[PDB]
Specification:
The structure is cut from a larger assembly and holds chains A (595 residues) and B (98 residues). Chain A is mainly alpha-helical and 595 residues long. Chain A is built from 26 helices and six strands. In chain A, the strands form three sheets. In chain A, strands 1-2 form a two-stranded antiparallel sheet. Chain A is globular. Chain B has strands at residues 3-9, 28-29, 43-44, 47-52. In chain B, the strands form two sheets. Chain B has a two-stranded antiparallel ribbon with strand order 1-4. Chains A and B meet through α1 of A and loops of B. Bound molecules: a molecule of 2 linked components (NAG-NAG) (5 copies) and 2-acetamido-2-deoxy-beta-D-glucopyranose. Chain A: It is found in: Cell membrane; Cytoplasm; Cell projection, Cilium; Apical cell membrane. Chain A: Its EC number is 3.4.17.23, 3.4.17.-. Chain A: One of its GO terms (biological process) is tryptophan transport.
């Protein structure tokens, strides 16, 4: 009966909140002060949380799921009843964890040695990522691109084939058709009177939104190709694809390292307020106190006053071994801490606004039950953090926060320099993200057999992304598995939808703050009505369907690409005038070796 | 490490009458199945403990409460406020209260 499930969850909601607390408090003491008497302090305290949750999970199947009427207590029950693994045979369950540990340690400890000196050998993160991000030598970028895929990616090919079979068995025992349908279960919504969403409906909404970005991406692809021919003459065709090893990093995920070759007006400095911070003696604490004044300006609460003692805003005065990585912690019981090692720079002035945005999202849904204290889907949590960073990087906000000469002149040449640096990171990553999840979805359902994995991968690079390989690759390579998110078992569609939600939030908040100009000049400071539009979504958590959360801000029930294109229309107008003598589009027949 | 000595009751058959008190420790029975003094599904111990810890956000830290309740049965009198006294002005037509 349904009233027994309510009494089940309230014993759960008070044993979990304490056991999650000290399992996360011990993870704080390891992260900010590393010993090994802290790693053993967090492994036993971490396993008491994991052993407790599988005990309550096997108690949750005593209650049926379709004999429930209240939507909230049904949502908590389905998130706890989830079997996930453990549906496999107990010798297949230990084979799967052996593969996931072997693929993870090949990616982090794989070395590449030089053919002129076999005694010097580079790892990926120090040394191989620096070549792909800084070099202008064609022959050295071609060496680092091919040798990472032929010496490390060939080890992951027999391991990734066994990984697909075991993950499809686990997904079909949980009544999905494949493992790709298991990943799309985040966006599913069942029976809330007009807000429903199918797991197959996500596939059409991604492909419908993508064919409206292809006019903008084609003009960006044509402008970068014309600028890369001056940097690498006799290597690039003026009507063809771009070679895969000249894109700024190892995989071509972000084009953000191509800015020094593709800058529109290099005689205008892109605005940088780092010298005005060290001329006014701003400490470590000023960067967060101006960040807290931004959020109280819009109508959001202060920091919790436990935030100021418990947090560790710099690396300590001790030479203290403590993972230095910006992050926002939500230990529980209303205890919010930020861990970062901040330097006096406009870079960490902006990520301070980003990391505080995770905190203000966390402080808002802290009145829901324990199992609904996440973002409404996997994409909302990063998207609310980046609309705080866009509004703080504007020169309108910088001159009113005291950091820009009240006699500063923004010209139309510097807005093109700023918008093109945004499009190399935002627009340049959208066909990469769409192509990769489309390839992984077709591998799991079996539309691509294993004798055509690397054949269909490079046909989709030339057609969707416009990127050609420099050396042909047969079915002994596995080039997707040489990325971190593929070999470490992570979903990748959250980076596509976060980019679309980010400009839907920003365009909906700037109509409430009564903006008049272009969308990229907007700032939501001093408003109250925009914050009330934002706070009505922030407090929902997972208690409502995410389509119901979007109408509280945007006014629509689906993700939309038209606010993303309105942000880049000053660039799209300027790009169509720079490509009057160029060719827009590419040919899938040209190759850098096929002459 | 958590002060686990401060408990509260989280299951009862029926809400309390005003100023009523209940220190029993019988195993609660949520479902219809009888409990027979042992724990299990739908048979819960009725007391939980605040695990208080010094690094808790406000609203999670312990507050001490005192409830004063003045009652007036039907006696002849009892405790009350204090009494203020001024100075005695000797020699002058005065308005006095002794
Ligand atoms: C890292 O934290 C641990 C524990 O928080 C520190 O180790 C000991 O902590 C106790 C407190 O319970 C002290 O009485 C001991 O003196 C600490 N050990 C030592 C060797 O000092 C540890 O000190 C912290 N790390 C550093 C570098 O201070
Ligand atoms: C079941 O649904 C009802 C409404 O559909 C929820 O009722 C609300 O409960 C809160 C506190 O529990 C009250 O403050 C509200 O006034 C109630 N609303 C109404 C309309 O009466 C109820 O909370 C849900 N059950 C659970 C366990 O959350
Ligand atoms: C979870 O996996 C189990 C198999 O281990 C599935 O079958 C359940 O088996 C248990 C006994 O171990 C029964 O109590 C359940 O009734 C069975 N399933 C149900 C509730 O029909 C079970 O179907 C899986 N649960 C999910 C999430 O589908
Ligand atoms: C920035 O604004 C100036 C001012 O309008 C633009 O200069 C004009 O450019 C057009 C097209 O080349 C000419 O027909 C006008 O005669 C120019 N104006 C003047 C006063 O000379 C300039 O092109 C703009 N730059 C960008 C990048 O948009
Ligand atoms: C936006 O908010 C800021 C912060 O309160 C306002 O800045 C104040 O501006 C006045 C006059 O411009 C100064 O006298 C104050 O010293 C400023 N305050 C601070 C804390 O620096 C700003 O005026 C607001 N914008 C509008 C349009 O009202
Ligand atoms: C936030 O804190 C400041 C001082 O730190 C205070 O003046 C302000 O009133 C606080 N905000 C609210 C809503 O009380």
């Amino acid at each position: 009966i349904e009233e027994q499930a309510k009494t089940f969850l309230d014993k759960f909601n008070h044993e979990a909140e304490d056991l999650f607390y000290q399992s996360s408090l011990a993870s704080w003491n390891y992260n900010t002060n590393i010993t090994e008497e802290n790693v053993q302090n967090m492994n036993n305290a971490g396993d008491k949380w994991s052993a407790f949750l599988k005990e309550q999970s096997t108690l949750a199947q005593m209650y049926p799921l379709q004999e429930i009427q209240n939507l909230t207590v049904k949502l908590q029950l389905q998130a706890l009843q989830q079997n996930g693994s453990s549906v496999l045979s107990e010798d297949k369950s230990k084979r799967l964890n052996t593969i996931l540990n072997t693929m993870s340690t090949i990616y982090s400890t794989g070395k590449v040695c030089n053919p002129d000196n076999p005694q010097e050998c580079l790892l990926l993160e120090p040394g191989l990522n620096e070549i792909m991000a800084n070099s202008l030598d064609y022959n050295e970028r071609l060496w680092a691109w091919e040798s990472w895929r032929s010496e490390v990616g060939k080890q992951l090919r027999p391991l990734y084939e066994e990984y697909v079979v075991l993950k499809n068995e686990m997904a079909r025992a949980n009544h999905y058709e494949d493992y790709g349908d298991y990943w799309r279960g985040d966006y599913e919504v069942n029976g809330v009177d007009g807000y429903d969403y199918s797991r197959g409906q996500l596939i059409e909404d991604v492909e419908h939104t993508f064919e409206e970005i292809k006019p903008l991406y084609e003009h960006l692809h044509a402008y970068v190709r014309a600028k890369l021919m001056n940097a690498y003459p006799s290597y690039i065709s003026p009507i063809g694809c771009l070679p895969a090893h000249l894109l700024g990093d190892m995989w071509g995920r972000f084009w953000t390292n191509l800015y020094s070759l593709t800058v529109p007006f290099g005689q205008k400095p892109n605005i940088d307020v780092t010298d005005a911070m060290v001329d006014q003696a701003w400490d470590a604490q000023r960067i967060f106190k101006e960040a807290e004044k931004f959020f109280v300006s819009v109508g959001l609460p202060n920091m919790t006053q436990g935030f100021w003692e418990n947090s560790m805003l710099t690396d300590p005065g001790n030479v203290q071994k403590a993972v230095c990585h910006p992050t926002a912690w939500d230990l529980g019981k209303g205890d919010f801490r930020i861990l970062m090692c901040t330097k006096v720079t406009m870079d960490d002035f902006l990520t301070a606004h980003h990391e505080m945005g995770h905190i203000q999202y966390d402080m808002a849904y802290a009145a829901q039950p324990f199992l609904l204290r996440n973002g409404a889907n996997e994409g909302f949590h990063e998207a609310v953090g980046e609309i705080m960073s866009l509004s703080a990087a504007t020169p309108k906000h910088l001159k009113s926060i005291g950091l820009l000469s009240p006699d500063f002149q923004e010209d139309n040449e510097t807005e093109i320099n700023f918008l093109l640096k945004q499009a190399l990171t935002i627009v340049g990553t959208l066909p990469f993200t769409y192509m990769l999840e489309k390839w992984r979805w077709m591998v799991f359902k079996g539309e691509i057999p294993k004798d055509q994995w690397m054949k269909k991968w490079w046909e989709m690079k030339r057609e969707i992304v416009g990127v050609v390989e420099p050396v042909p690759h047969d079915e002994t390579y596995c080039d997707p598995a040489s990325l971190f998110h593929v070999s470490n078992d992570y979903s990748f569609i959250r980076y596509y939808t976060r980019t679309l939600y980010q400009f839907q939030f920003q365009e909906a908040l700037c109509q409430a703050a009564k903006h008049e100009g272009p969308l990229h000049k907007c700032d939501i400071s001093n408003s109250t009505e925009a914050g009330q539009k934002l706070f009505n979504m922030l407090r929902l958590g997972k208690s409502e369907p995410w389509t119901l959360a979007l109408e509280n801000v945007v006014g629509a029930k689906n993700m939309n690409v038209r606010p993303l294109l309105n942000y880049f229309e000053p660039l799209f107008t300027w790009l169509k005038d720079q490509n009057k003598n160029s060719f827009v589009g590419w040919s899938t027949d040209w190759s850098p070796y096929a002459d | 490490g958590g002060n686990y000595n401060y408990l509260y009751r989280l299951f009862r058959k029926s809400n309390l009458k005003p100023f009523e008190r209940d220190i029993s420790t019988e195993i609660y029975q949520a479902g219809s199945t009888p409990c027979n003094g042992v724990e299990g599904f739908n048979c819960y111990f009725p007391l939980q403990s605040y695990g208080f810890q010094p690094t808790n956000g406000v609203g999670y830290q312990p507050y001490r409460v005192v409830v004063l309740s003045f009652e007036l049965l039907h006696a002849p009198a009892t405790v009350c406020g204090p009494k203020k006294s001024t100075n005695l002005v000797k020699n002058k037509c005065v308005n006095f209260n002794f």
